[PDB]
Write an enzyme that holds these catalytic residues in place. Structure first.
Site, PDB file in Angstrom:
ATOM      1  CG  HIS A 134      -0.390   0.149   2.529  1.00  0.00           C
ATOM      2  ND1 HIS A 134      -0.250   1.373   3.148  1.00  0.00           N
ATOM      3  CD2 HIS A 134       0.036  -0.773   3.429  1.00  0.00           C
ATOM      4  CE1 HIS A 134       0.259   1.202   4.358  1.00  0.00           C
ATOM      5  NE2 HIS A 134       0.445  -0.091   4.552  1.00  0.00           N
ATOM      6  CD  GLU A 161      -3.111  -0.875   5.586  1.00  0.00           C
ATOM      7  OE1 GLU A 161      -2.617   0.229   5.932  1.00  0.00           O
ATOM      8  OE2 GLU A 161      -3.268  -1.821   6.394  1.00  0.00           O
ATOM      9  CD  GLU A 162      -1.599   2.967   7.534  1.00  0.00           C
ATOM     10  OE1 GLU A 162      -2.329   2.602   8.493  1.00  0.00           O
ATOM     11  OE2 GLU A 162      -0.406   2.621   7.430  1.00  0.00           O
ATOM     12  CG  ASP A 187       1.648  -3.200   5.422  1.00  0.00           C
ATOM     13  OD1 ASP A 187       2.471  -2.270   5.573  1.00  0.00           O
ATOM     14  OD2 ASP A 187       0.449  -3.076   5.723  1.00  0.00           O
ATOM     15  CG  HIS A 195       0.589   3.863  12.149  1.00  0.00           C
ATOM     16  ND1 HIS A 195       0.044   2.776  12.797  1.00  0.00           N
ATOM     17  CD2 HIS A 195       0.508   3.596  10.826  1.00  0.00           C
ATOM     18  CE1 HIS A 195      -0.316   1.876  11.903  1.00  0.00           C
ATOM     19  NE2 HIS A 195      -0.054   2.352  10.700  1.00  0.00           N
TER      20      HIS A 195
HETATM   21 ZN   LIG Z   1       1.055  -0.905   6.445  1.00  0.00          ZN
HETATM   22 ZN   LIG Z   2       0.017   1.011   8.927  1.00  0.00          ZN
END
Ligand SMILES: [Zn+2]
Ligand SMILES: [Zn+2]
Length: 366
Positions: A180, A227-228, A255, A333
């Site tokens: 992603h 995706e987030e 990922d 994140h």
């Molecule tokens: Zn990810």
């Molecule tokens: Zn993530």
């Protein structure tokens, strides 16, 4: 005027939610909740600390036809032989020698230079355009003539998913390799998550594009949007494939491919929940046989990454990752998710894994 979204959330996580929300429906394992779009990101950060799973965005599934409300749709949501072998050693080994580690590092350098790559932001759209044109450049550079690219829209999200294919006219169940492209809002270099996976498969794509081999299956390289936001982009991509009747044999998701918990421990991890057991077992064999590093196993819970979207439709899907769930990159994140945390040998190994996967499975027809 403010946009609402609906999320499916595991009970262990939902019990700890403090942002305002309405519960649409609930069963033993899940709640489906309604939240402001602007609050979704705080839930992601909370999910990281709770570490019992993430969530899936079901906004699109609740607007589905032959339904009345949302609460009634939510309640219905919550209600109630493939063999894999290693047969292309010579070809895979030659291809692995072609992987260029500096390409991954330079792709990653470009991706982290955006303030963020959020699906609601113009830089999210720039990212998708940049990936698409890079793929197209490489196809021309190596004279690969059977390729194509297109965007799959992401509803009200600006950022589309990027679908690329090698062998666009081959009529056989496809092989899919994914990552992603997006990040959260705010300052998010997103180097580990998921610049690293995006860059690993871009270099794998380069190696396949430079190949003169005619495969027996089409090979898709896909960079999912959003995706987030709860796997929104991969959900749209899977829906596109179903609507267009594009058959799919096997899917792998990359990922996070760059963070080593121990710089001298090259172990690669195979995730075993929301994945196909036989295909996961096959990944372990590929790693052992071609990459020659140890394999270990882990679980990462509900809504973990885009392979789950395929798995929900009973399509074989697998997920190799840089660490165990317990030892994952702690700066995920955040604005500290930077290239200086990462290990290029690790990322190169995941890139090698993508190429072996693609070559072994696309060279065989059931
Ligand atoms: Zn990810
Ligand atoms: Zn993530």
């Amino acid at each position: 005027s403010p946009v609402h979204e609906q999320l499916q959330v595991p009970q262990c996580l939902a019990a700890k939610i403090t942002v305002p929300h309405k519960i649409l429906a609930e069963n033993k394992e899940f709640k489906i909740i309604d939240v402001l779009s602007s609050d979704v990101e705080t839930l992601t950060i909370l999910a990281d600390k709770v570490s019992c799973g993430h969530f899936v965005n079901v906004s699109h599934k609740l607007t589905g036809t032959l339904a009345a409300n949302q609460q009634q749709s939510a309640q219905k949501l919550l209600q109630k032989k493939d063999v894999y072998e290693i047969k292309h050693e010579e070809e895979v080994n030659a291809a692995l020698k072609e992987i260029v580690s500096d390409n991954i590092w330079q792709t990653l350098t470009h991706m982290t230079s955006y303030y963020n790559r959020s699906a609601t932001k113009d830089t999210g759209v720039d990212t998708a355009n940049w990936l698409k044109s890079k793929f197209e450049q490489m196809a021309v550079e190596y004279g690969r003539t059977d390729t194509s690219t297109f965007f799959v829209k992401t509803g009200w999200y600006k950022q589309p998913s990027l679908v690329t294919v090698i062998g666009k006219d081959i009529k056989a169940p496809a092989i899919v390799i994914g990552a992603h492209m997006d990040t959260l809002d705010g300052r998010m270099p997103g180097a580990g998550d998921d610049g690293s996976g995006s860059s690993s498969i871009m270099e794998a794509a380069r190696v396949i594009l430079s190949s003169k081999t005619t495969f027996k299956r089409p090979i898709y390289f896909i960079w999912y949007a959003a995706e987030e936001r709860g796997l929104v982009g991969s959900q749209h991509v899977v829906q596109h494939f179903q609507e267009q009747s594009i058959p799919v044999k096997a899917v792998v998701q990359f990922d996070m491919t760059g963070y080593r918990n121990d710089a001298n421990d090259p172990t690669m991890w195979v995730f075993t929940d929301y994945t196909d057991r036989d295909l996961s077992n096959y990944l372990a064999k590929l790693i052992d046989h071609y990459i020659h590093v140890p394999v270990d196993y882990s679980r990462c819970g509900y809504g973990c990454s885009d392979h789950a979207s395929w798995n929900e439709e009973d399509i074989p899907a697998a997920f190799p990752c840089e660490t165990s769930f317990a030892d994952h990159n702690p700066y995920i994140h955040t604005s500290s998710d930077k290239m200086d945390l990462l290990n290029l040998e690790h990322m190169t190994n995941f890139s090698k894994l993508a190429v072996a996967f693609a070559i072994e499975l696309a060279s065989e027809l059931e």
